[PDB]
Task: structure prediction
Amino acid sequence: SFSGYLKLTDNVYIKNADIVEEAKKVKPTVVVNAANVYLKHGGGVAGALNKATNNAMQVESDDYIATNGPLKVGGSCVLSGHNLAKHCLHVVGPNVNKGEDIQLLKSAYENFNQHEVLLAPLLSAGIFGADPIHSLRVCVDTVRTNVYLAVFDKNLYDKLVSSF
Ligand SMILES: CC(C)[C@@H](Nc1ncnc2[nH]ccc12)C(N)=O
Result:
């Protein structure tokens, strides 16, 4: 049910859209969250997805951390998608503003290969501080399953396409 995407490769598609609005429209099997290790969904993609769930994502996430402890940078966990998707795959890309290793970005994108099709944002981009052009290149060179990327900023979308 994905519509209006530009094909980049055999398996990677892109659209200028808010991932929350795309998830509400499509109700995909898997929506990816740009999470941190504590699953504290304050801003960016995570804060916007959590707000759209009426804070249910945060309540579930707090129970997950109380039981399991924090995720690893480069790691993931599968939780409910609430009203947005069947599942949410919470993936932790490195936060360059905190000195985390950018080489962990490839490990973060490898989590996508466990799912046949995903709606996702660019990992480590936006408020996580990494170069979005680099994040798109690692995505295309790492993910083998079908990924539909939603990029909120129109100016950045146009730059990603024109430099691909
Ligand atoms: C990861 C970033 C490059 C990107 N953020 C996002 N991209 C897609 N849906 C989103 N909802 C809330 C944030 C958000 C951006 N700022 O264009």
Summary: Residues 6-161 form a domain with the Leucine Aminopeptidase, subunit E; domain 1 fold (CATH 3.40.220.10). The CA atoms of residues 23 and 61 lie 19 Å apart.
